[model samples]
Structures are given as structure tokens and as C-alpha cells.
Target: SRAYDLVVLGAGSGGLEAGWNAAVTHKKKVAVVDVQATHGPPLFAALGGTCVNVGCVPKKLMVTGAQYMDLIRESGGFGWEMDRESLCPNWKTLIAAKNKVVNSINESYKSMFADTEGLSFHMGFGALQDAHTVVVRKSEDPHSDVLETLDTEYILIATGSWPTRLGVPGDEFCITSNEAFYLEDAPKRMLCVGGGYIAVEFAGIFNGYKPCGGYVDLCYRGDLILRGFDTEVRKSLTKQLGANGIRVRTNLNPTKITKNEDGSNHVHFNDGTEEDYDQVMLAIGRVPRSQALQLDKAGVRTGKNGAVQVDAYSKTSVDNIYAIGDVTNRVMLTPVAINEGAAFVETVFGGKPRATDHTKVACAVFSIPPIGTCGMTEEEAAKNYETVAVYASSFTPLMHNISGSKHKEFMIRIITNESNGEVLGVHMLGDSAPEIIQSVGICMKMGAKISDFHSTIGVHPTSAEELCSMRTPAYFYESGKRVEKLS
Candidate 1:
């Protein structure tokens, strides 16, 4: 058995950051254990966890590849004398380049840990043996009972999550984000199931692959892709997606998936409809990866979704055992997880009790045009506050106007509290929306009000300027419905 001041389970963002903070800042001896990386048909198993290996990094690379097509199509308006027939994306080449970048990042993570003084990295699956002890087994040998045992003063669980499956008939035939990254070839026809960010993002990616016939479609049981986002933004994005050739099927649930003799899939829906496609992808949601950890042996409590129960300071019921990141089922963003890790270190070792504030976290969905949001939604503000002022602007962006692109219109909405004019939310659907919301997020976090936005001069001739130039409430809402403006 090995002993240390701290034992961290999982080598993702949260676990790594927590280990670093403990070892470097507090001079505590720390060891991080994670499942060994496995490469296969579903290509994800890498060192940097979901974001680097499969989730964000690779997805963004695909998104950029898609955006280049849009730029090429728009180049005509810029007087660029180019023949569209001669220029086309080489899918294999793009995939090769993306893999090279992914490999570099994976190596960088390993290099960083190797240089860390008081931190040790173990490649294995970690399980709780007791309150202060953990048992780790090598991924290569499942038959062997135990490869090593670790005893520590404290334990941190940050195993993150895996994509969820619908459990419908022939569900095994479908692929998740884990497998989407390494597809042998981009499907000529792709069907994405679910309305979440992952589903839409994949649909957008495939739709952007100009060579693959661009017949990408999405089917969701819900009415919209982003279920919890602002309603108007959701509607706007859906319309835009449809206009851009991404067929969106709503209120359509998949009951079964049948494989055709020709190697295609015939998906049967509850609405008495069936469609064939070259590939079917499921992006329904994600569940915490805590089941295999054997938390019950350590007397640690878990919630309904197998998420570790933690206090504001990320401390679990078993005082020395803590959980952070998606494993806790809190805000599952990578940044949120990193913050929790830092807060966990400060609270336990640095003599400073801290809580990660989850409110007003900025988020972005990398759909075709993309979306960015910060603070509360319009519906949320209306329900929580007595009254809300909503200002909205929809227009063709200058770039679109110049390029004469059909898919050019973008939207911006700002929700404010009528009583104080404090900006309650900022939501956008357009190009660079993600980058735009990040800048606006700082203002909302600092308690900036609608008047403050209006008083600040805009950056002239820019899409973002619309946010600052909005005057007069386009509408008012009280308790979630449109109402007469308050004086």
C-alpha cells in the first residue's frame, strides 16, 4: 500500500488542478489516479479528459473546418475571383491535422505532470476501499484483483461523465460523442438524436462537411435544441438551422433503430415515421461516472444520478472525502470544475474556506452560427423579479450584408430588472456570439445596468454595438408573459 497526504481519483481538469493546488500551494504530497488511455473505433480515451480529447477541442476543430466553407461561399461578394468547383475540403487531411493537435495536447498534459514536484500520476481505475484508502487496478488487466493500494489523509473524486444512451431497441448500433470523433468516413447522410448542445454541434459539423452531401439532420423529442436557454433564442436558432439545410425534427422520439442489409439504419419514431441514414448519433445527455467508484464502502452519500453529495465547500459526508466537477452533478463546465478544484484546495489545505459561486456563469454553444448567454434567461428573470424589461434587435450583420449570404440575420436580446435597470441576462445568436457574450459577461457580473450599457459608446459598425445602442423596451414581461410596460 502506498500513502500520501492526498489521493485524487480521475486525471481530468478538476483532479489535475486539485492535485496541483494541493502539492504546489500547500506542499502536500498528492497522487492522481486515472484509467489508462485507450485508443479505438470511438477515439476519445486520452489524458486531458472529455474537453481535450473529444468534447470541446476536437469539436471546435470540426466547427472551424465547417466555418471555412461558409467563408469560401461568402468570398464571392468580396470580389475574390475563385472557382468554387476547384476548391473543396479534403476530409482525411482535415482529420489528420486535428489528430496531430490532439496528440500534442495529450503529450503536453503528461509533460506538465512529469515536471510537477510533489505530484504523482497513476494510470489505473481508482475505487474507494475505505474512508482514507483507495484501490487501483490497471486497465490492461481486469482479471487481477488489485494492482496497488493508496492510503491518504484526503480523497477527491473527479471522474467526470460519459454520454448517455436512450436504451431503445438497436441503441447499441448508434454512436455517441466518444465515437463520432474517429469515424472512418463522414457519413453521406447523418441523423443526430437529441436536442442538447452536443447533438446540435455534431449536426452542425456534419452539415458543414461540404463533400459529404451535407444532408445532415437532427431529431429531438423536445420542441427545441437548447431546452433551458431563452425561448426566443431557441426559436431563432432553430429557424436559422433550418434555413442553413439542417433539417430539425421536433417532438419525434426514436422507438427503434433497425439496421438495413445495405449497412444503413432505419430509425422508427413514435410518431409513426421512419427514415434511413448512413449513421445515427445519440447526444441525449450525460450521467456522472461514479457507479464504479464503490462510494458506499467509504460511507459516502450519492444523489439520485450517482453524483457525489457535497457541501458548498465541496466537502462530502465523509469529512475527508470530497468531490468536484461533473461527478458532483453541479455546473458541469470544465471551468466550473477547475474553480471547484481550486476552492476545494483552499478550503482544506490553505486555511481559507471558499465556495465556488455558480451564478451568472457565461456559456456558449458552438452551433452553426453559435450562441452565447450569461446571467438569467428572460423567463427566469420574469419569474424571479416583479417585472422585466426586454430589449431585442434582429438584423443582417454587416459581414453578411457585404457578402450577400442568405444566412446572414443575427439576433441579440437583453433582459433587465425594471425596478433597478440591472441587466439580468444577455443572450445572442449570431457569428462570434460566444466571444461577444464573454465580454458582456464581465459587465453583468459587475452589476452593470441597462443604463450603463446605453451610456457606453458602441464600437461603431459592429454587431456588438447593437447591445449598447438598444433603447426602449421592445416588450415587457411579468411572471413569464408579455405585459404592458411599467411607466
Candidate 2:
């Protein structure tokens, strides 16, 4: 007899939702399995996936922790002397506290799994044996003993992803983002490779390290950081990173890495320039964790980077199998992963036909000068639409006027249709950019127009008021041709 109606592999953002929804909402017997934490072993469990441990929660705490340096430095100008002691960063203690917070969240997720009826949580490694069979094994090692065998009507692969290392000479000496959490102490000087979220955040966090701060070099093969973000925000953040004392090494990549006798690293670059650093972090790429699962055994097809192939219904190539989240390689964000998870539950168990609509997703970059944007960028809009109107506002915030906040300028760009004033996109770079765009995205979701922005009275003494205040267009484009050019 089948042990469960559904067997969900990889207890991450997507799998949790799919497993929980199937059991609670549809009363289907479910089993969710994830690998036991082998990295640090104690700070993590077999649930919550990359977001809780390595991706969002812990990373944000680190970013927020780094933010205090700015708060204290700027507050000195505001006549609030928090004292020199605040500048002393005991890196180990902060890491410990952050892990505790992570553990607390892990417990919350575990509690929900515990409380749910007819839902079985397996703390082991799961893999596909066939279309309807999954075997949970001891740890993630292939040779480990099989703990349980699950036979289900449907299987969901949400194995997520892991940090990838460059195939260079001394990659063994480098740390991935996963190891960043477990470092004994912060490095005095650091080199971070790549232009992704992990690369940008760690570069900022490293440079923001207290007392005198670490000398951080952020190297990316691209011309600028954050390749998919709005070009203007990218340029703004590049300047901000420089102003924050991070050296941007653009158009450069590692050719080889050599370990120094002093236990540091000597990194050789493609440009023939070699540098030394106390630590080197490779944040370049992540491959889906699906490879180890042997998806082909179940007739599941995988695409680029071993990501499971899935359709709009989150249904995989195998009829009884489905996939979501980073493993599916769709959207590749936690919220969207959760979205697909819920959508899959409806299509399978709830007797409803539904497909994930990937459109206008809000994304944020938590750099020193953070960014929140949704819909199309100026470049994207110009290409996709016949005509686009762009309104842009860039200025120093009022708080910066008093505190003399370095890298504290606010920038907003709104793209609209010139024909009828329909809002096409929203983007911002400044404090609370993430929080601000979240609310605006709701209105944009309902097809808000520039007229809608004109009707609302904004709250004064806030940076967000600029959203409505952007009355004039910086420029207009007709079929990718510039119409209005502002000085």
C-alpha cells in the first residue's frame, strides 16, 4: 500500500507549503523529507531550506547588523553620541546570536509541521527511485542506509540549490556562502567573487565590519554588479559601494587561487593582476541540488544546471512527479517558490485547474543603498513597449541633511505608457526601498496609472512621498527612440 498521497522531497520554502497544504487543506497524507544539516550540524535542521539558514533570514540579519555602523556614525552628527564602544564588533558573538535566531525560526517551522495532522516530516535525505517511489536515506551520502521508503501517488522535487565553486586551482581554500556563517572570525581583508545577491551583500557586510572596517574587493566578470537590476540603480549602487570603501573590481574574474604560507590567499586574476586576502568567498553560482536525486530514474527531465523541468502546473516530465522553487529554476525566489507550491496543491489535490503566473514580481537588493523594483526596467520597457514615459527623482534625503549620511541619496524611477498614463514599472534605491516597493506593487498589480499616483496625498517627512511627487518625465521614448531629453 502507498504510504502517502504525496511525497515531497526537500523541505524548503516550496516543499513546506506544498506538503502542509496537501495535508491540512486537502486531507491528503503527506511526507516531506530533507537532508540533515551536515555543514555546521547544530545551527540548522532538516527544514526551512536555504532561505532560513543561508539565503534570506541570516543574510538579512547580517545586513541589518552591518547597518548599525551607519546608524552610529550618522547619529554622531545628529547629536546622539552612542559612544565608541558601539563600533567594536565582536564578529563571533554576532554570528552566534544570528544562528540562535535562525534556530528559533527553524523551531517555528518544525512546530507547524508537528501540529499538522497526517503530515510526516522525515529528517533525512530523499531521492527518486521511480516516478512514485522516494527513498529517504541517512544523511545525504549515497552509501548511507535507507531510513524509509515512500510510495505515493505524486512526488514533488523541491531540493533547492547549493553554492557552487569555481573550478580554479585553489577552490578548496575558499569559502562558499554556506561556510560564511560558520567562520571563526571576520576576515581582516576579504575578496568576494561574482555579482549575485550573495556576492553584493557579503561585500557590503565585510566593508561595514566595525572599528575600521574590512578592506573588501568585490570582483565580477560583468561590467557592473547586479546584472538583471535596473541600470540606473546599478550605477547608483556602484557609486555607493565605492563611497562605503568597497573596491569594485569590474570586468575581472579569477583565473587561479594560491594559498599563502600565512594562511591567507593569493588570488590570480584573468587580467594578470594577483592580490592577497585574509579570506576569499566564492558567491558566483549555485547548481540545483537535484543531481544527486537521480531524477532520470523516475523519468524526470532536468535542464540547465540540473534544474528539474516543469510546466505551468508545476508538473514535471514524469506524470506522478512535480517540482518547484530553485530546483525548478523558475523565478528563483523564495516567495515565488511558495507561490508555485501553493498553486501545485490546488491543481493536484484541490481538484482545481491552476497555473503559476510569473509576472511583475517584486525583487529587492539589500546593498548599503538597497533597491526595490517591480515590473519592467527602462531598458526592458523600451524594448517591449512602443512608447514609454519615464519619471525619475534623485535627491539627498532629509535625514541625511542632519546626520550627514554618506551614500544616503534616494532615487526613484517610474516608467509609464504615454498613450494613457498606465504605470509600467516602479524602481527605487535608498533606505526602506524594499518596504516601500512592496506596498506600491499591490497597486501596480491592479493596473494603476499615473493618474492614480496624482490622486493620492502622500505622507510628508518621508522618502516615499517622492513616489507621487514625481510629476514630470525625465524623458519619453517612442519605439525605443528618445523623445524628451532632460538635462
Candidate 3:
């Protein structure tokens, strides 16, 4: 049997991208396999992983749609005599549209794989049979776990990540993000647990939902959301989220959940506090889906979280095997996986020594107002650099000036080295904030300074203009400690 040049496990975003890049660009024989069976609920059925399905895409749609609600509320102030009417959003219709959009993207991915030479797709779970072979198993085989083996010179694990449930009592009572996305009906009250990005994003989504649109009583237990972000960003976002009417319970943990007579969940906190809600969802975080791959058979090492251990060049413990995307569990972003996969092929086969700088990559969370950040946060910069300068700003948007919405707020901050004035980080929250920050990210990557941002001319009447126009002297901290300027 002829060994494939590259055999990829999982046809999700990372796997398909790796297969296509290798087969089409390097002309290598490649194949990708995905688990054929899907779990219950519309959330897991979202074919395009977290981002394209429920995570970033639909979340943004919900946010964008809700923003329009703010617009409608403020329309009267702009001299538009809009009737005092409420708009109802069809849950089924919107969900149907979201599914259609996902299906189209999934189909396009399949087409791309088919169009690429020396590439093949299989819908089944893949397991490492040996150093040079993999076994694909069918989902519904009542008999033994018979595996169809394929020979491969190189294997890439890109199984991605999935939601891991907390092992608390009555944990089954709560749904994961996968189950949260496609609810048939909107609940009047909802409680989400965890202080991670998932919990924060869902909380914002529920609070931002239009009343005649989807409505859920949002509740969460977290001192602050976006745990690893800048301190100011976290504080400002917490204030803004509170203004949006999310009941945030800081420094508490949900110990157990009880089913009430009304079919709502009674969430019991560790502090002897109990609350009733229509739904309870867990958004703690995700774990890599690498355990089922049988990596041990091929002598591939895995990390603490079941993430396949990989080096800088995307090479796993076994030289013949590679891992990318969530399997590595370094950066969960889909684009990072694609970039790493493409660079892997070039470095290994195309004679181009390409490697990704895992540092300074940008990412966004589609919370109520949306957030994007690249490089280090103020807290992180203080720890890493000896002396850092922090520039921060927050204000109401121009559109909100007419929209009577008190919850809408924009945030911008730049972290730099005090001595060299080199900008190390750029973070922003609000409309088109990611688009603007990403441009700054490019300049920061090129070793640009704070002056670059200060010297850039502003585009008037735009939210991004504030980034270039921050006039206050950058806050200074010496030797990783805040400095007090003498009065």
C-alpha cells in the first residue's frame, strides 16, 4: 500500500485547512477524517466548530441585531417619529438562517478539499494505529471496534476542542455552549457559571438580547469577566456589563442545581445563596479532543489537558506526527491553527523554514460590545517589561449619543515600554474596534512606538479616531510598580 504523504485527523477548520494547504500547495497526498456522529441539541450540530457556528459568528449576529434595538430606541431623538412599538424577532427563523449559513460554509470547505489534488475526506473518527498508520472507525458499529487502517508518512492531529462539563452534583442539569445556541424557546431567566471568556460572552449575549427579540434573565458568578485581560479593561467591561443589566455575582460558586416545580433551575451557591432561573448553562472552557485519537499507540505525548504536545514547528513527540489547532491547545483561535498548518507544510516540505511567533497574536470576543486585543495587557506588560507606560480611554459612542442607551461604551488602551516608548499592546472594545486594533497590531509587530499612534492623523466623527487622539501622558510604572507623580 502506498503511504499518504500526509494524513490529517478531523475535518474541522484546522484539519481541512492543513489538508488543503498540503495537497494543493505542496502536492502531497492528504486525507482528513471527522467524527461522523453528532451529539444532541442544535448547538453541537453546528458544523463549523465554535467560531463559525455558535461562538463568534452567531454571537456577533445577536450583538449586531441587538445594537439595532438600541438604534430603534434612540430613533425618536433623531427626529424620526417612530411609533412606540416593540419588535419581535423570530427565534426559529433566525436559527434557521444561522444553520443555513453554517451549512453553506461547511459545503464550501468540502468543495475546497475535493478540488485540491491528492486530497480525500472521510467522515469517521480517526485513531493512531501505529507510527505510520491510522485507523478510521464507523460511528454505529455494534460489533467490535474494527478500524480501517491507512498508511501515512506523516500524521497531523487537528481534532479541535469541545466543552468539558464541571463534575459538580446535578451537573447534567446544565447545558454547554453547544446546547445553548439552538434553544427552541427563549427562557425568561438564565444562569451561567465560570469566569472565563465563554461565560462572559454568553452573559453579554443574554443581556443584549432585544425583548421583542430573544430574552433571558442573565445571571453569572464571577468577580470579573475576561480574567486574563487588562485590569482597566476588566473593570470598565464589568461596569458596562452591569449597565446593560446583567446580574453579576462576584466571588461565588454555584454548588448545585435543583429542578423546580415550574421547570426552572434553582441554582444553589456555595455561600448558602439560592436562586431560581429558567435555564442553567456552563461556559467554563473547552478541552482538547485528543484523547480518542489513541495517540499513545504512536508514542505521541499529550499535555495536562489532553492536548497533543507539539513543538514550535508544529511537530509532535513523534517526528512523523504533527499537531495543530486546539489539539495543541496553545491558542484556540481558528486562524492561528490555519496559519500554523500552512507554515508547517512550507517548513517541512516546501524548503521554507517558517515558524509562527506564538507571541503577540490578536483575538476577539463577541461579548455585548465586542472586544479585540493584541499583545500584552497592562498587568501582563508590567510583569514582563521592566518599565511600561499605559494609555487608556473609555467613552460613549457617537451613535449612542442619539440612541438613549446608557449601556453602550467604547474602550481603548495601549501598553508600551517607558524607556524605549515601544508600544507593546493595543486593546479596544466597541463597534469596529477589532478592525481598528488589528491595523495597530501590524504596526506594533513591526516595532512601532507610541508616537506612531500619536502622529497618525485622525478620521473625524469615527470611534477609532480616539485611538490616535489620546492626549494624556501615558501612565508610568517603574520596575513593575506603579509610579506616583509628585503633585
Candidate 4:
């Protein structure tokens, strides 16, 4: 077999990008391998991965769908009479539409790789044979796989992550994010376990489903979502979550799952609380999917969590071997994975070496009312910087005012270093809150001050406008001690 310039393991977002970059930008012979002969599972194959499929896209659709139920209830106040029976959403119809959107995106990814020159796709599981060689095994017969050995100048490992499962007694009774996307039927009562973004996002999704009493039970072992955020932001979001009808169980842990004869699970908590729900989801977290890669056969070193160890430039301890994305367990975000793969190519072959700066990378949770943040939280600001200033505000969106729905408070927090006025953070909670803060992230990155938010005129009749209208300074801290602000 002809030797290739580069060999990439795992045809995920990271691997695909890396292969494309190496071939197009550097004009190198590259081949990519994946376990699934097609693209991926339902959500993954339809879209890029978790973000486009089960994570961000679908959750937003569900949130928007569920919000209408509340809007219909308040129609009488707006002088528009709405028939209760006529205002429901067609779940099957919406699900079909969602599938169409995902399919369109999947087609785009396939086209990009197919059109690129000097890039080949291998459909099977990939294992590191040596520092410069990889073995591909057919998915059907793992043992009878032919080891196509190739001498490579460089290798990239981009095997992404998989859903983490709790090893409880009745663990089989619980589902993960992968199952949540293709559930045949929506459960009347849902139990979401974990304090992470995955758990909170699903809690909101289940509660957002149209029908009445589609109750959501969120079991968080900590304070709330965005655990390390500012106190004011945390408390305000907790209040908003409750107002949106999500039932939260904090400081509580699920002890056991008892299967009932009625075909439901009874979740017993260590705190002596019990709840029966049709479905129990384990959203604790995800783990790097590198166990099956046969790294030991190739002398590759992995971290405590089974993540392949890589250097500043993504070079593994083994020469000629590099890893990116969830395989490295650096930042498990899809966009971050894409960026890392692209950066690896640039550093190695694009003539310009660039390292990934993870600071201030934006993140969002698709709750009934979405939330997003970039930069440091108030707690982080207070701990890291010598001086910190906090500016926050909460108010109803203008659309809600006209919709006759109760005013849903939007909280915006801007923290800055008092000495240099270097904006330390930008966090918010409200409708379209993630989109609103995304624009401000650029300003914060450019070293904008908290005064910029105050000086700027807010756009009228938009939910996000209130972020700039904050007058009350939440707090001023010097060396973590509160000081009086001159009015």
C-alpha cells in the first residue's frame, strides 16, 4: 500500500477538519477512519455531533414549542380570543421538520470531505499500530479485520466522546443524552439527574413539551446550573427557572432505582425523598471514547480520565502522534474541536503556528429561556483579580409586556477590574439571552469597560436591550472585601 503523508483516526468534526486542512492547505495525502461506515448515529450522522443534533438545536426547538403553551393561556389579556383546543403543537410534524434541518447539515459535511483532493475516508474502527501507523478494522468483524499498515509522517487522533453512564444497580433503567434524542414517546413524568449543563438542558426540554403535567424533576447535587458563575446571576437564574415551571431537587442524591410492576421507576434519594417517574435520565457527564482505540499497542500515553496526553502543539508523548478533541479531553465542545483540528494543521503545515486560547469561549444552555456566558464569573473575578466591580439588572422583556405574559426578568452581570477597568466577564439570563451576549463577547474580549454597557443606548422593544439599561451597581470589591460605591 502507498504511504500517506497524514493519517487521521476518527471521522468526527475534529478529524474531518484536520484531514481537510492538511490536504487542502498543505497538499498532503491524508486518510480518515471512523467506526461507523456511514457518518454516525441518528443525531450525529444527521448533523455534526451533539451540538447540532441532541444538544443545542433540538433543545432550542423544544423550548420554542413549549413557550407557546404559556402564550395561549395569556391570550385573553391581549384582547385576542384563542380556543384552547386549537393552540397545541403537532409533535410528529415538528419532529419531521427538525429531522429535515439536520439532514441538510449532514449532507454539507459529506460534500466538503468528498470534494477535497488527496483526502480518503476509511469506514471502520481505527487503532494506533505504531507512532506512524494505524490499523483499521471493519465494524462487522472486528477480529477478521485486515491491518493495512502505512508509514505516515504525522497522525491525528480525533476520536470524540460518548455518554457516561452511572453504574448503579438498575443502571439499565436509566437513559443518556443519546437516547433522549430518539425517544419513541415522551414521558409524562421525567427525572433528569445531574447539575451539569446536560442535565439542566434536558430538564428544560422535558418541561417545555406542550401537554399539561409533562412535569420535569431536576436532581442537582449542587446549587444550580452554571455552578461557578456569580452569586447574583446564580440566584436570579434559579428564581427564573422556578418561575418557568422546572421542579428542582438540590443538595439531594439518588440512592437507588426500584422498578415498579406498573412499568415505571421509583427513584429513592439519600435525603429520604422518593419520586416515581416514567423515565430517568443520567446526564452526569461524558467520557473520552478512546478505550477501544488500542492505544497501548502503539505506546501512547493517556491521562487519568483515559484521555490521550498531548503537548502544547497537540503532539502526543509518542513522536509523530497527535490527538485533538474529546480524545485529549481538553475542551469537549464541538466548535472547540473544530478549531483545535484546524489549528493543528496550521501549526504543523500552514506556515503560521497558532495555539488555541480557550479563554472567554462562549457557552449556552437551551432552557425554556436560554442563557449564555463568556469570560470570568463574579466569583472567579473576585478570586483572581485584585479589584472587581459588578453591575447587574433584571427586568421583563418588551415582547412579554405586549404578549400579556407575566414579565420574565432578564439578569445581566458585568464584572470588571476596578484598577484598569478591564472587563472580566459578561453573563446573562433571559430569552435569546445567548444571542444577545454573543455580540457583547467581542467587546469584552477587546478590553471594554463596564461603563461601555452603561453608556450605550439599548435597542428598544427587545429583551436584550435591558442588559445595557442597568443603573444599580451590584457590588465593588477590593481584595475580596466589599467597599462603598460613591453614588
Candidate 1's residue-wise lDDT over 1-487, tens digit each? 4479899998888888899999998888898987655333433555777777877888999999988877888888999868786455777777888888888887777887788888888777889889889889864343556878998999999889888988788999998888888887778788999999999888888887745354888898877768889898998889888988899999888899999999999989889888888899999888998888889889899986898999999889999999999989988898999999999999999897999989989999999889999988877788898888999899887677778676667789999998799999999998989999998888988999999998988898888888878989898987677797655
lDDT string for model 2 (327-422, tens) is: 887788899999999999999888886887788888898888788998988887888888889999998977788887746789999999888898
* lDDT value, candidate 4, whole model: 0.74
lDDT of 2: 0.84
Of 2 and 4, the candidate ahead on lDDT is 2
Candidate numbers, best TM-score first, in rank order = 1, 2, 3, 4
In terms of lDDT, which candidate is strongest?
1
Per-residue C-alpha lDDT of model 3 across residues 100-123, encoded as one tens digit per residue: 666677676667656777987766
Please give, for residues 30-110, the per-residue lDDT of candidate 4 as tens digits.
988765432234425322445555566666676676677666766766787756753435666666676677666667766
Clashing pairs in 3: none
TM per candidate: 0.96, 0.95, 0.92, 0.90
Q: TM-score for model 1?
A: 0.96
lDDT of 2 at 73: 78
Weakest ten-residue segment in model 3 by summed lDDT:
37-46
Scored by CA lDDT, what does every candidate get? 0.85, 0.84, 0.74, 0.74
Candidate 1: lDDT of 321? 94
Estimate the overall C-alpha local distance difference test score of candidate 1: 0.85
Evaluated at residue 228, the lDDT of candidate 1 is: 89
